[PDB]
Each structure stands twice: as structure tokens, then as C-alpha cells.
Amino acid sequence: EVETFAFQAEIAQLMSLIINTFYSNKEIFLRELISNSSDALDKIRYESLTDPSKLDSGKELHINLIPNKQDRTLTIVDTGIGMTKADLINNLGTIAKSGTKAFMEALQAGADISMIGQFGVGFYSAYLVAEKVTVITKHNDDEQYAWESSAGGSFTVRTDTGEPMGRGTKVILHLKEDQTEYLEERRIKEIVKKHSQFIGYPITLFVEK
Amino acid sequence: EVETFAFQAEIAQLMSLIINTFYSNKEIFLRELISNSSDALDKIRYESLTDPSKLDSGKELHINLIPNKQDRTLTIVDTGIGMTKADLINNLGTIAKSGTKAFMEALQAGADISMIGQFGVGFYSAYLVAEKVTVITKHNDDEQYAWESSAGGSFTVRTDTGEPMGRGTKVILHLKEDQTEYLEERRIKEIVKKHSQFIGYPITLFVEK
Ligand SMILES: COc1ccc(-c2snnc2-c2cc(Cl)c(O)cc2O)cc1
Ligand SMILES: COc1ccc(-c2snnc2-c2cc(Cl)c(O)cc2O)cc1
Ligand SMILES: [Mg+2]
């Protein structure tokens, strides 16, 4: 009961561009993922203003960054609105076919990879640093699902068997071998202070034994 | 059947700050409003990917800028998802109480008024240039409503009697007397090219007789 899907051709092309393009300022992936968490936190915050029971699955709106040097993973957890199975399958809630088109044109009209979030498809910048990304998500009244892709044209979706998350999304980045700087506390703190210093939810960087 | 509402105190404070603070780079209002139109266009585009009938109220996703020097108005029209009456009353679909708090703190931690969109409340930058803003909006399956406010602590909502809009939002800025530069074609073109050159929907600047 793992379902395997092909990416639409425009999204496979976006992913190949991100993986194959020489581009040294990889650290923008974290700004993009923290931005998406902030947008998801804004959404549950706005829904709660009229229906407080929407927070029954967790009242605290925040972001956790969890490095694990043994697993070579950096995990970003938020307690935002979460995604339904349909939204995961439909490009993680993004307008990715049209966004990808505009981004390609921009890149011709001069833009650079760091502008990717202006085209609605910043999630895929994860592949600047990760060989595999796993997305575990829970929206109120839908079940918990895990999406995962090592690129190559396909992704899987299954019902998740992990720990329950309450509500929100967890992005687990399985880092490339040469990208382990992004597990180091000083490097993560530096990038958060540089690019996410005004995000309006607490961001807690976990430490390791 | 005009309903009059008080702004929550944090939003009245945000509006007073924007109106009373000396700050010369007013032109950022247009970037903020065009951004909100783009976000609303992204939303109907994403809903249409799974339900095409959502576009029965208009298939074209675009933004029009309409200056009128006789009325001293600059109007921004989009054919995005639109807002329900509830969303208009609840601060135009924004998390404005919490966004306002963060923005105030940022402004202390050094930030400037141009960063307002990072706090979810960029709409209110309209009051850098407008004495009165009128917001006319139509979401699928809700009626067309007009919101309006000259600040001073209150806004009104009524069912709109204007021309039907199909779907989307129209922001009519009734400009301050000293802010008429923003009706001039070269000035609007300059600001769109400077700050909204990569927005992914057509932006048509209307001309005047
Ligand atoms: C910008 O488009 C977006 C589309 C969808 C989302 C949503 S809705 N629920 N979770 C996420 C989310 C998705 C991702 Cl990929 C993530 O990294 C963190 C998240 O909380 C956010 C932004
Ligand atoms: C950033 O938060 C936002 C909150 C709500 C919206 C939405 S949903 N439908 N219309 C608008 C909209 C609202 C405004 Cl004010 C506008 O200028 C243009 C619009 O299309 C957009 C952004
Ligand atoms: Mg945004």
C-alpha cells in the first residue's frame, strides 16, 4: 500500500535543473522550507480565528529544526495546517506546472536559483542539499501521510506508520555526503539569522548528544 | 444595510503608524497589492487543478491597473479566488493581530516599513498613498461585497451594487492630493518593472482618454 507516481514532466525538469545546475549558494533551501512552514502556520492561525477547535490538534504554532549526524538528516517540523493526501500528490500544495514555467523564463530573463520562492516552487530547492526528501504531514480530519522522492521522475505516497504528529508537516532531508555542514549548529544558526530572522513563529534548533 | 465595524485595536495602531510615520518610499504599496493579487490568483489556479468548474466564473487569471485622474483613483483588479464576507471582516484574509505585533517588534529590531509584507499585513500599506480604500470582492458561491475605510478606527461592509466582477478582488485607492504621481503611466510602469517584474500573471496598465 505504497503508491508510486510520476512527476509531471515540468516538475521533473525543475528537479533536474536544481540537481544538475552548478550553483554554490545552496543554503537558501532552509529559508525556503522555513517560509513554507510559516505560510502553513499562518493558515492554521487564520482558520483558528473563527474556529478555535481547529487548534484541538495542537495549540502551539512553531518550527523545530532537528539535525541528526548519525542518520545524516536535517528535519524541519512545523505545527501548521498540514496537507491532505490530495495536496501532497498535487505537488505539495504548489502551482508547480505554471510556477516552473515562469521560473525557467526568469532564469533566462536573468534571475538566479535563489529567486525560486517567487515562483511558488521553493520546496524543490531541498534537492540542492538532499539526495532523498521525505514529507510527513497531517491535516485536521485527514490521516497522516508520508511522501517521499529521491528524484529520478517518481515519488511515493503511503499512510504513515511513524509517530503521530498532531497536525502539521515534517520535512526530513537525507543530505548528500558533501552537504553535512547543514547539520552543524553554528551553520544552521548562521543561515536562520541571515535569511529567516523575521519569521513570526519560534524556531527552535535542537542539539545533539 | 451598510454595516460599520471597529478595527481591532492592533490594526488601528498599524494603520496610524502607516499614516503618521515619516517615510518617503511610499511606492511599495503597489508591490504589496500586486503581491496579494498574485497570491489570490495562485489560490484559484491551485483549486482549478482539481476542479476546473471553479473557473466557470472566469478563466483568465490576470491583474489590471486602472488609473483615473478625474476621480483621483488607482484601481487594481484581479481575477483571483476572492474573499468571503467573513474574510473581508476578518482583516481582509490576514493574520493581522499577530502580524502587526511582529511588525512592530521588527521595526524596533531595526526593520523598515517596506518589510511589511513579511508580516502578512501588506494591504495596509495602501494607506501610504490613499485617503480612502475601497475593496470590492467576489468569491465563488458567495455574493459580491464592498469593504471600505478612511481609517479613523472603522470600516464598512455592504453588499455591492456595482458592476458584477465574476470572481476576484478590486482595490480602489482614492489617492491623497499629493500622491497623484501614482496615476501617471511612466511612474506606474517604473514601479511595476522595479518591484513586480517577476509576477507570474499578466499585468495590464490601462490608459486614459
Ligand atoms: C508555498 O506553497 C506552500 C504550499 C503548501 C504548504 C503547506 S500546507 N501544509 N503544510 C505545508 C508545508 C509544505 C511544505 Cl513543502 C513545507 O516545507 C512545510 C509545510 O508546512 C506551504 C507552502
Ligand atoms: C497576504 O494575505 C492575503 C490575504 C487575502 C488575499 C486575497 S484572497 N482573495 N482576494 C485577496 C486579495 C486581497 C487583497 Cl487585500 C488584494 O489587494 C488583492 C486580493 O486579490 C490575498 C492575500
Ligand atoms: Mg508569500
PDB file of all heavy atoms in Angstrom, chain B residues 29 33 66 68 71-77 123 126-127 129-137 146-149 160 162 165 169-175:
ATOM      1  N   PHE B  29       3.586  50.428  -1.835  1.00  0.00           N
ATOM      2  CA  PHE B  29       2.171  49.981  -1.726  1.00  0.00           C
ATOM      3  C   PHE B  29       1.842  49.155  -2.951  1.00  0.00           C
ATOM      4  O   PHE B  29       1.033  48.203  -2.817  1.00  0.00           O
ATOM      5  CB  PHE B  29       1.223  51.159  -1.532  1.00  0.00           C
ATOM      6  CG  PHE B  29       0.895  51.888  -2.804  1.00  0.00           C
ATOM      7  CD1 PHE B  29      -0.174  51.429  -3.601  1.00  0.00           C
ATOM      8  CD2 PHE B  29       1.756  52.838  -3.330  1.00  0.00           C
ATOM      9  CE1 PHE B  29      -0.417  52.064  -4.877  1.00  0.00           C
ATOM     10  CE2 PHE B  29       1.538  53.443  -4.588  1.00  0.00           C
ATOM     11  CZ  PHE B  29       0.448  53.040  -5.386  1.00  0.00           C
ATOM     12  N   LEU B  33       0.179  45.306  -3.013  1.00  0.00           N
ATOM     13  CA  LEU B  33      -1.174  44.942  -3.509  1.00  0.00           C
ATOM     14  C   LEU B  33      -1.093  43.958  -4.690  1.00  0.00           C
ATOM     15  O   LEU B  33      -1.912  43.018  -4.815  1.00  0.00           O
ATOM     16  CB  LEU B  33      -1.935  46.213  -3.922  1.00  0.00           C
ATOM     17  CG  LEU B  33      -2.209  47.105  -2.709  1.00  0.00           C
ATOM     18  CD1 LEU B  33      -2.866  48.424  -3.295  1.00  0.00           C
ATOM     19  CD2 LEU B  33      -3.185  46.518  -1.632  1.00  0.00           C
ATOM     20  N   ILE B  66      -5.708  50.351 -13.203  1.00  0.00           N
ATOM     21  CA  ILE B  66      -6.582  51.335 -13.921  1.00  0.00           C
ATOM     22  C   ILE B  66      -6.460  52.694 -13.202  1.00  0.00           C
ATOM     23  O   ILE B  66      -7.031  52.913 -12.157  1.00  0.00           O
ATOM     24  CB  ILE B  66      -8.053  50.853 -13.910  1.00  0.00           C
ATOM     25  CG1 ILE B  66      -8.126  49.441 -14.437  1.00  0.00           C
ATOM     26  CG2 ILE B  66      -8.817  51.837 -14.832  1.00  0.00           C
ATOM     27  CD1 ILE B  66      -9.549  48.840 -14.405  1.00  0.00           C
ATOM     28  N   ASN B  68      -7.303  56.724 -12.938  1.00  0.00           N
ATOM     29  CA  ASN B  68      -8.382  57.661 -13.376  1.00  0.00           C
ATOM     30  C   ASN B  68      -8.040  59.005 -12.740  1.00  0.00           C
ATOM     31  O   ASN B  68      -8.242  59.198 -11.542  1.00  0.00           O
ATOM     32  CB  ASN B  68      -9.722  57.114 -12.944  1.00  0.00           C
ATOM     33  CG  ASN B  68     -10.880  57.961 -13.462  1.00  0.00           C
ATOM     34  OD1 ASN B  68     -10.825  59.180 -13.346  1.00  0.00           O
ATOM     35  ND2 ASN B  68     -11.921  57.304 -14.013  1.00  0.00           N
ATOM     36  N   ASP B  71     -11.177  61.030 -11.202  1.00  0.00           N
ATOM     37  CA  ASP B  71     -11.707  60.526  -9.900  1.00  0.00           C
ATOM     38  C   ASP B  71     -10.578  60.502  -8.831  1.00  0.00           C
ATOM     39  O   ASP B  71     -10.859  60.343  -7.674  1.00  0.00           O
ATOM     40  CB  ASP B  71     -12.207  59.101 -10.102  1.00  0.00           C
ATOM     41  CG  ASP B  71     -13.478  59.018 -10.924  1.00  0.00           C
ATOM     42  OD1 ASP B  71     -14.126  60.091 -11.171  1.00  0.00           O
ATOM     43  OD2 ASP B  71     -13.830  57.894 -11.242  1.00  0.00           O
ATOM     44  N   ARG B  72      -9.336  60.726  -9.262  1.00  0.00           N
ATOM     45  CA  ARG B  72      -8.100  60.588  -8.449  1.00  0.00           C
ATOM     46  C   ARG B  72      -8.063  59.193  -7.812  1.00  0.00           C
ATOM     47  O   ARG B  72      -7.787  59.057  -6.598  1.00  0.00           O
ATOM     48  CB  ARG B  72      -7.917  61.682  -7.392  1.00  0.00           C
ATOM     49  CG  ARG B  72      -6.436  61.913  -7.038  1.00  0.00           C
ATOM     50  CD  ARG B  72      -6.257  62.411  -5.675  1.00  0.00           C
ATOM     51  NE  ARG B  72      -6.786  63.704  -5.672  1.00  0.00           N
ATOM     52  CZ  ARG B  72      -7.176  64.368  -4.584  1.00  0.00           C
ATOM     53  NH1 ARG B  72      -7.152  63.885  -3.354  1.00  0.00           N
ATOM     54  NH2 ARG B  72      -7.579  65.600  -4.762  1.00  0.00           N
ATOM     55  N   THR B  73      -8.248  58.195  -8.661  1.00  0.00           N
ATOM     56  CA  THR B  73      -8.204  56.823  -8.172  1.00  0.00           C
ATOM     57  C   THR B  73      -7.259  55.977  -8.936  1.00  0.00           C
ATOM     58  O   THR B  73      -7.087  56.135 -10.136  1.00  0.00           O
ATOM     59  CB  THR B  73      -9.554  56.106  -8.211  1.00  0.00           C
ATOM     60  OG1 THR B  73     -10.098  56.125  -9.538  1.00  0.00           O
ATOM     61  CG2 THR B  73     -10.559  56.770  -7.204  1.00  0.00           C
ATOM     62  N   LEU B  74      -6.553  55.061  -8.234  1.00  0.00           N
ATOM     63  CA  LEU B  74      -5.840  53.995  -8.916  1.00  0.00           C
ATOM     64  C   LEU B  74      -6.499  52.706  -8.473  1.00  0.00           C
ATOM     65  O   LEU B  74      -6.623  52.449  -7.247  1.00  0.00           O
ATOM     66  CB  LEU B  74      -4.366  54.033  -8.475  1.00  0.00           C
ATOM     67  CG  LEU B  74      -3.571  52.803  -9.029  1.00  0.00           C
ATOM     68  CD1 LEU B  74      -3.476  52.920 -10.570  1.00  0.00           C
ATOM     69  CD2 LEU B  74      -2.112  52.916  -8.462  1.00  0.00           C
ATOM     70  N   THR B  75      -6.985  51.906  -9.465  1.00  0.00           N
ATOM     71  CA  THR B  75      -7.728  50.667  -9.101  1.00  0.00           C
ATOM     72  C   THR B  75      -6.908  49.471  -9.557  1.00  0.00           C
ATOM     73  O   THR B  75      -6.337  49.451 -10.643  1.00  0.00           O
ATOM     74  CB  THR B  75      -9.044  50.650  -9.788  1.00  0.00           C
ATOM     75  OG1 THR B  75      -9.876  51.782  -9.367  1.00  0.00           O
ATOM     76  CG2 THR B  75      -9.808  49.346  -9.562  1.00  0.00           C
ATOM     77  N   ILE B  76      -6.801  48.491  -8.661  1.00  0.00           N
ATOM     78  CA  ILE B  76      -6.072  47.210  -9.001  1.00  0.00           C
ATOM     79  C   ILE B  76      -7.101  46.144  -9.026  1.00  0.00           C
ATOM     80  O   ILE B  76      -7.739  45.903  -7.997  1.00  0.00           O
ATOM     81  CB  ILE B  76      -4.955  46.955  -7.969  1.00  0.00           C
ATOM     82  CG1 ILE B  76      -3.889  48.119  -7.945  1.00  0.00           C
ATOM     83  CG2 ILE B  76      -4.235  45.616  -8.284  1.00  0.00           C
ATOM     84  CD1 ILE B  76      -4.080  49.125  -6.943  1.00  0.00           C
ATOM     85  N   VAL B  77      -7.281  45.481 -10.181  1.00  0.00           N
ATOM     86  CA  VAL B  77      -8.300  44.429 -10.287  1.00  0.00           C
ATOM     87  C   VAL B  77      -7.574  43.138 -10.528  1.00  0.00           C
ATOM     88  O   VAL B  77      -6.695  43.094 -11.422  1.00  0.00           O
ATOM     89  CB  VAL B  77      -9.174  44.730 -11.530  1.00  0.00           C
ATOM     90  CG1 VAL B  77     -10.326  43.694 -11.539  1.00  0.00           C
ATOM     91  CG2 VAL B  77      -9.766  46.119 -11.411  1.00  0.00           C
ATOM     92  N   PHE B 123      -1.387  44.712   2.801  1.00  0.00           N
ATOM     93  CA  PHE B 123      -2.564  45.504   2.325  1.00  0.00           C
ATOM     94  C   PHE B 123      -2.578  46.884   2.921  1.00  0.00           C
ATOM     95  O   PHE B 123      -2.930  47.868   2.228  1.00  0.00           O
ATOM     96  CB  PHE B 123      -3.903  44.820   2.726  1.00  0.00           C
ATOM     97  CG  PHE B 123      -5.093  45.695   2.556  1.00  0.00           C
ATOM     98  CD1 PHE B 123      -5.545  46.095   1.302  1.00  0.00           C
ATOM     99  CD2 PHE B 123      -5.677  46.196   3.709  1.00  0.00           C
ATOM    100  CE1 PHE B 123      -6.649  46.923   1.162  1.00  0.00           C
ATOM    101  CE2 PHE B 123      -6.780  47.055   3.592  1.00  0.00           C
ATOM    102  CZ  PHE B 123      -7.209  47.481   2.319  1.00  0.00           C
ATOM    103  N   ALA B 126      -1.524  50.349   1.652  1.00  0.00           N
ATOM    104  CA  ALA B 126      -2.328  51.259   0.812  1.00  0.00           C
ATOM    105  C   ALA B 126      -2.474  52.653   1.400  1.00  0.00           C
ATOM    106  O   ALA B 126      -2.602  53.642   0.647  1.00  0.00           O
ATOM    107  CB  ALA B 126      -3.759  50.636   0.611  1.00  0.00           C
ATOM    108  N   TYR B 127      -2.501  52.699   2.756  1.00  0.00           N
ATOM    109  CA  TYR B 127      -2.716  53.993   3.412  1.00  0.00           C
ATOM    110  C   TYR B 127      -1.468  54.899   3.382  1.00  0.00           C
ATOM    111  O   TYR B 127      -1.584  56.033   3.877  1.00  0.00           O
ATOM    112  CB  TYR B 127      -3.273  53.793   4.835  1.00  0.00           C
ATOM    113  CG  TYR B 127      -4.721  53.254   4.736  1.00  0.00           C
ATOM    114  CD1 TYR B 127      -4.961  51.902   4.721  1.00  0.00           C
ATOM    115  CD2 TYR B 127      -5.775  54.152   4.585  1.00  0.00           C
ATOM    116  CE1 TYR B 127      -6.291  51.408   4.519  1.00  0.00           C
ATOM    117  CE2 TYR B 127      -7.094  53.708   4.433  1.00  0.00           C
ATOM    118  CZ  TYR B 127      -7.318  52.341   4.410  1.00  0.00           C
ATOM    119  OH  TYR B 127      -8.619  51.810   4.233  1.00  0.00           O
ATOM    120  N   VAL B 129      -0.622  56.025   0.566  1.00  0.00           N
ATOM    121  CA  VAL B 129      -0.941  56.879  -0.571  1.00  0.00           C
ATOM    122  C   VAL B 129      -2.394  57.233  -0.672  1.00  0.00           C
ATOM    123  O   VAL B 129      -2.737  58.135  -1.357  1.00  0.00           O
ATOM    124  CB  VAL B 129      -0.445  56.322  -1.952  1.00  0.00           C
ATOM    125  CG1 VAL B 129       1.053  56.104  -1.892  1.00  0.00           C
ATOM    126  CG2 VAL B 129      -1.103  54.962  -2.242  1.00  0.00           C
ATOM    127  N   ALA B 130      -3.267  56.475  -0.010  1.00  0.00           N
ATOM    128  CA  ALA B 130      -4.731  56.635  -0.158  1.00  0.00           C
ATOM    129  C   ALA B 130      -5.366  57.195   1.090  1.00  0.00           C
ATOM    130  O   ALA B 130      -5.077  56.693   2.205  1.00  0.00           O
ATOM    131  CB  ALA B 130      -5.398  55.267  -0.458  1.00  0.00           C
ATOM    132  N   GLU B 131      -6.245  58.181   0.873  1.00  0.00           N
ATOM    133  CA  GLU B 131      -7.106  58.661   1.959  1.00  0.00           C
ATOM    134  C   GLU B 131      -8.283  57.727   2.282  1.00  0.00           C
ATOM    135  O   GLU B 131      -8.824  57.749   3.426  1.00  0.00           O
ATOM    136  CB  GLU B 131      -7.610  60.115   1.658  1.00  0.00           C
ATOM    137  CG  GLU B 131      -8.453  60.207   0.491  1.00  0.00           C
ATOM    138  CD  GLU B 131      -8.928  61.626   0.131  1.00  0.00           C
ATOM    139  OE1 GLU B 131      -8.440  62.555   0.764  1.00  0.00           O
ATOM    140  OE2 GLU B 131      -9.782  61.804  -0.757  1.00  0.00           O
ATOM    141  N   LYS B 132      -8.707  56.936   1.293  1.00  0.00           N
ATOM    142  CA  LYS B 132      -9.855  56.054   1.439  1.00  0.00           C
ATOM    143  C   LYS B 132      -9.493  54.840   0.546  1.00  0.00           C
ATOM    144  O   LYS B 132      -8.943  55.095  -0.562  1.00  0.00           O
ATOM    145  CB  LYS B 132     -11.128  56.725   1.012  1.00  0.00           C
ATOM    146  CG  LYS B 132     -12.351  55.713   1.184  1.00  0.00           C
ATOM    147  CD  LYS B 132     -13.671  56.491   0.987  1.00  0.00           C
ATOM    148  CE  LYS B 132     -13.901  56.879  -0.408  1.00  0.00           C
ATOM    149  NZ  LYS B 132     -15.220  57.590  -0.467  1.00  0.00           N
ATOM    150  N   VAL B 133      -9.774  53.612   1.025  1.00  0.00           N
ATOM    151  CA  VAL B 133      -9.595  52.455   0.136  1.00  0.00           C
ATOM    152  C   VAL B 133     -10.919  51.713   0.177  1.00  0.00           C
ATOM    153  O   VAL B 133     -11.611  51.527   1.229  1.00  0.00           O
ATOM    154  CB  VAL B 133      -8.609  51.575   0.798  1.00  0.00           C
ATOM    155  CG1 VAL B 133      -8.378  50.268  -0.048  1.00  0.00           C
ATOM    156  CG2 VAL B 133      -7.217  52.326   0.901  1.00  0.00           C
ATOM    157  N   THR B 134     -11.298  51.308  -1.051  1.00  0.00           N
ATOM    158  CA  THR B 134     -12.498  50.538  -1.165  1.00  0.00           C
ATOM    159  C   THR B 134     -12.122  49.134  -1.767  1.00  0.00           C
ATOM    160  O   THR B 134     -11.301  49.081  -2.740  1.00  0.00           O
ATOM    161  CB  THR B 134     -13.508  51.201  -2.194  1.00  0.00           C
ATOM    162  OG1 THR B 134     -13.789  52.580  -1.827  1.00  0.00           O
ATOM    163  CG2 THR B 134     -14.805  50.335  -2.224  1.00  0.00           C
ATOM    164  N   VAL B 135     -12.591  48.011  -1.160  1.00  0.00           N
ATOM    165  CA  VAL B 135     -12.221  46.693  -1.596  1.00  0.00           C
ATOM    166  C   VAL B 135     -13.506  45.991  -2.047  1.00  0.00           C
ATOM    167  O   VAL B 135     -14.388  45.749  -1.174  1.00  0.00           O
ATOM    168  CB  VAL B 135     -11.454  45.947  -0.545  1.00  0.00           C
ATOM    169  CG1 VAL B 135     -11.122  44.515  -1.103  1.00  0.00           C
ATOM    170  CG2 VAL B 135     -10.142  46.684  -0.279  1.00  0.00           C
ATOM    171  N   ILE B 136     -13.607  45.678  -3.337  1.00  0.00           N
ATOM    172  CA  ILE B 136     -14.848  45.013  -3.817  1.00  0.00           C
ATOM    173  C   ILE B 136     -14.405  43.578  -4.178  1.00  0.00           C
ATOM    174  O   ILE B 136     -13.354  43.365  -4.760  1.00  0.00           O
ATOM    175  CB  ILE B 136     -15.427  45.697  -5.029  1.00  0.00           C
ATOM    176  CG1 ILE B 136     -15.839  47.120  -4.532  1.00  0.00           C
ATOM    177  CG2 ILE B 136     -16.651  44.854  -5.538  1.00  0.00           C
ATOM    178  CD1 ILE B 136     -16.280  48.029  -5.400  1.00  0.00           C
ATOM    179  N   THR B 137     -15.130  42.565  -3.706  1.00  0.00           N
ATOM    180  CA  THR B 137     -14.605  41.165  -3.867  1.00  0.00           C
ATOM    181  C   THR B 137     -15.707  40.206  -4.114  1.00  0.00           C
ATOM    182  O   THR B 137     -16.841  40.419  -3.650  1.00  0.00           O
ATOM    183  CB  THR B 137     -13.787  40.789  -2.630  1.00  0.00           C
ATOM    184  OG1 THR B 137     -13.000  39.577  -2.894  1.00  0.00           O
ATOM    185  CG2 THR B 137     -14.631  40.575  -1.352  1.00  0.00           C
ATOM    186  N   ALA B 146     -18.604  44.952  -0.782  1.00  0.00           N
ATOM    187  CA  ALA B 146     -17.646  46.108  -0.802  1.00  0.00           C
ATOM    188  C   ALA B 146     -17.295  46.434   0.646  1.00  0.00           C
ATOM    189  O   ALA B 146     -18.194  46.720   1.491  1.00  0.00           O
ATOM    190  CB  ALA B 146     -18.375  47.266  -1.442  1.00  0.00           C
ATOM    191  N   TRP B 147     -16.002  46.512   0.892  1.00  0.00           N
ATOM    192  CA  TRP B 147     -15.451  46.956   2.181  1.00  0.00           C
ATOM    193  C   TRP B 147     -14.883  48.287   1.913  1.00  0.00           C
ATOM    194  O   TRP B 147     -14.430  48.637   0.841  1.00  0.00           O
ATOM    195  CB  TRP B 147     -14.269  45.955   2.453  1.00  0.00           C
ATOM    196  CG  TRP B 147     -13.400  46.276   3.704  1.00  0.00           C
ATOM    197  CD1 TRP B 147     -13.447  45.619   4.883  1.00  0.00           C
ATOM    198  CD2 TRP B 147     -12.275  47.245   3.816  1.00  0.00           C
ATOM    199  NE1 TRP B 147     -12.413  46.081   5.756  1.00  0.00           N
ATOM    200  CE2 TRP B 147     -11.695  47.046   5.092  1.00  0.00           C
ATOM    201  CE3 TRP B 147     -11.694  48.200   2.939  1.00  0.00           C
ATOM    202  CZ2 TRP B 147     -10.622  47.836   5.526  1.00  0.00           C
ATOM    203  CZ3 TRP B 147     -10.596  48.960   3.360  1.00  0.00           C
ATOM    204  CH2 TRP B 147     -10.072  48.741   4.638  1.00  0.00           C
ATOM    205  N   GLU B 148     -14.974  49.193   2.906  1.00  0.00           N
ATOM    206  CA  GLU B 148     -14.321  50.468   2.700  1.00  0.00           C
ATOM    207  C   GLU B 148     -13.906  51.128   3.993  1.00  0.00           C
ATOM    208  O   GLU B 148     -14.435  50.865   5.078  1.00  0.00           O
ATOM    209  CB  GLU B 148     -15.318  51.452   2.023  1.00  0.00           C
ATOM    210  CG  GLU B 148     -14.793  52.843   1.700  1.00  0.00           C
ATOM    211  CD  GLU B 148     -15.808  53.522   0.812  1.00  0.00           C
ATOM    212  OE1 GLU B 148     -16.868  54.016   1.379  1.00  0.00           O
ATOM    213  OE2 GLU B 148     -15.684  53.554  -0.469  1.00  0.00           O
ATOM    214  N   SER B 149     -12.745  51.934   3.977  1.00  0.00           N
ATOM    215  CA  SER B 149     -12.341  52.514   5.253  1.00  0.00           C
ATOM    216  C   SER B 149     -11.515  53.733   4.844  1.00  0.00           C
ATOM    217  O   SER B 149     -10.646  53.710   3.918  1.00  0.00           O
ATOM    218  CB  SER B 149     -11.432  51.615   6.077  1.00  0.00           C
ATOM    219  OG  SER B 149     -11.080  52.347   7.316  1.00  0.00           O
ATOM    220  N   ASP B 160     -22.405  44.618  -2.589  1.00  0.00           N
ATOM    221  CA  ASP B 160     -22.078  45.614  -3.595  1.00  0.00           C
ATOM    222  C   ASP B 160     -23.176  45.772  -4.634  1.00  0.00           C
ATOM    223  O   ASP B 160     -23.756  44.799  -4.969  1.00  0.00           O
ATOM    224  CB  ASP B 160     -20.807  45.165  -4.306  1.00  0.00           C
ATOM    225  CG  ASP B 160     -20.243  46.197  -5.229  1.00  0.00           C
ATOM    226  OD1 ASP B 160     -20.160  47.410  -4.904  1.00  0.00           O
ATOM    227  OD2 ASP B 160     -19.715  45.888  -6.300  1.00  0.00           O
ATOM    228  N   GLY B 162     -22.342  47.755  -7.508  1.00  0.00           N
ATOM    229  CA  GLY B 162     -21.597  47.953  -8.714  1.00  0.00           C
ATOM    230  C   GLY B 162     -21.701  46.888  -9.782  1.00  0.00           C
ATOM    231  O   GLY B 162     -22.525  45.960  -9.746  1.00  0.00           O
ATOM    232  N   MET B 165     -18.326  41.412 -10.766  1.00  0.00           N
ATOM    233  CA  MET B 165     -16.970  41.121 -11.181  1.00  0.00           C
ATOM    234  C   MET B 165     -16.608  39.713 -11.609  1.00  0.00           C
ATOM    235  O   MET B 165     -15.460  39.467 -12.064  1.00  0.00           O
ATOM    236  CB  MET B 165     -15.949  41.611 -10.203  1.00  0.00           C
ATOM    237  CG  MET B 165     -16.064  41.182  -8.837  1.00  0.00           C
ATOM    238  SD  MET B 165     -15.543  42.660  -7.969  1.00  0.00           S
ATOM    239  CE  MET B 165     -14.472  43.205  -9.278  1.00  0.00           C
ATOM    240  N   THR B 169     -10.927  40.260  -6.898  1.00  0.00           N
ATOM    241  CA  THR B 169     -10.957  41.426  -5.992  1.00  0.00           C
ATOM    242  C   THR B 169     -10.553  42.670  -6.723  1.00  0.00           C
ATOM    243  O   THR B 169      -9.615  42.658  -7.567  1.00  0.00           O
ATOM    244  CB  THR B 169      -9.990  41.080  -4.862  1.00  0.00           C
ATOM    245  OG1 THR B 169     -10.496  39.980  -4.100  1.00  0.00           O
ATOM    246  CG2 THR B 169      -9.737  42.340  -3.887  1.00  0.00           C
ATOM    247  N   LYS B 170     -11.188  43.817  -6.366  1.00  0.00           N
ATOM    248  CA  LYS B 170     -10.850  45.158  -6.981  1.00  0.00           C
ATOM    249  C   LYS B 170     -10.491  46.027  -5.784  1.00  0.00           C
ATOM    250  O   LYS B 170     -11.349  46.170  -4.870  1.00  0.00           O
ATOM    251  CB  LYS B 170     -12.135  45.698  -7.683  1.00  0.00           C
ATOM    252  CG  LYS B 170     -12.063  47.087  -8.060  1.00  0.00           C
ATOM    253  CD  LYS B 170     -13.220  47.285  -9.118  1.00  0.00           C
ATOM    254  CE  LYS B 170     -14.533  46.836  -8.553  1.00  0.00           C
ATOM    255  NZ  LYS B 170     -15.544  47.404  -9.576  1.00  0.00           N
ATOM    256  N   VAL B 171      -9.326  46.664  -5.809  1.00  0.00           N
ATOM    257  CA  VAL B 171      -8.929  47.591  -4.713  1.00  0.00           C
ATOM    258  C   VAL B 171      -8.937  48.961  -5.311  1.00  0.00           C
ATOM    259  O   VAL B 171      -8.172  49.234  -6.277  1.00  0.00           O
ATOM    260  CB  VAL B 171      -7.543  47.217  -4.169  1.00  0.00           C
ATOM    261  CG1 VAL B 171      -7.126  48.312  -3.099  1.00  0.00           C
ATOM    262  CG2 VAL B 171      -7.549  45.861  -3.550  1.00  0.00           C
ATOM    263  N   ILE B 172      -9.798  49.876  -4.817  1.00  0.00           N
ATOM    264  CA  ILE B 172      -9.846  51.214  -5.391  1.00  0.00           C
ATOM    265  C   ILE B 172      -9.151  52.132  -4.374  1.00  0.00           C
ATOM    266  O   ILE B 172      -9.567  52.304  -3.264  1.00  0.00           O
ATOM    267  CB  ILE B 172     -11.356  51.685  -5.532  1.00  0.00           C
ATOM    268  CG1 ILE B 172     -12.054  50.640  -6.420  1.00  0.00           C
ATOM    269  CG2 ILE B 172     -11.337  53.120  -6.140  1.00  0.00           C
ATOM    270  CD1 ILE B 172     -13.587  50.866  -6.378  1.00  0.00           C
ATOM    271  N   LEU B 173      -8.047  52.749  -4.802  1.00  0.00           N
ATOM    272  CA  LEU B 173      -7.316  53.653  -3.918  1.00  0.00           C
ATOM    273  C   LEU B 173      -7.724  55.098  -4.291  1.00  0.00           C
ATOM    274  O   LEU B 173      -7.441  55.585  -5.404  1.00  0.00           O
ATOM    275  CB  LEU B 173      -5.812  53.507  -4.262  1.00  0.00           C
ATOM    276  CG  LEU B 173      -5.239  52.072  -4.071  1.00  0.00           C
ATOM    277  CD1 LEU B 173      -3.747  52.062  -4.485  1.00  0.00           C
ATOM    278  CD2 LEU B 173      -5.425  51.688  -2.617  1.00  0.00           C
ATOM    279  N   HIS B 174      -8.320  55.798  -3.307  1.00  0.00           N
ATOM    280  CA  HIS B 174      -8.679  57.176  -3.505  1.00  0.00           C
ATOM    281  C   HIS B 174      -7.482  57.966  -2.995  1.00  0.00           C
ATOM    282  O   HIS B 174      -7.226  57.992  -1.769  1.00  0.00           O
ATOM    283  CB  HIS B 174      -9.948  57.460  -2.671  1.00  0.00           C
ATOM    284  CG  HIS B 174     -11.114  56.566  -2.994  1.00  0.00           C
ATOM    285  ND1 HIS B 174     -12.081  56.917  -3.911  1.00  0.00           N
ATOM    286  CD2 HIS B 174     -11.417  55.311  -2.558  1.00  0.00           C
ATOM    287  CE1 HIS B 174     -12.936  55.915  -4.025  1.00  0.00           C
ATOM    288  NE2 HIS B 174     -12.549  54.925  -3.220  1.00  0.00           N
ATOM    289  N   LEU B 175      -6.660  58.450  -3.928  1.00  0.00           N
ATOM    290  CA  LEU B 175      -5.308  58.934  -3.534  1.00  0.00           C
ATOM    291  C   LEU B 175      -5.353  60.242  -2.765  1.00  0.00           C
ATOM    292  O   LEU B 175      -6.286  61.070  -2.998  1.00  0.00           O
ATOM    293  CB  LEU B 175      -4.426  59.120  -4.762  1.00  0.00           C
ATOM    294  CG  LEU B 175      -4.200  57.792  -5.571  1.00  0.00           C
ATOM    295  CD1 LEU B 175      -3.363  58.127  -6.850  1.00  0.00           C
ATOM    296  CD2 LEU B 175      -3.509  56.766  -4.702  1.00  0.00           C
TER     297      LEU B 175
END
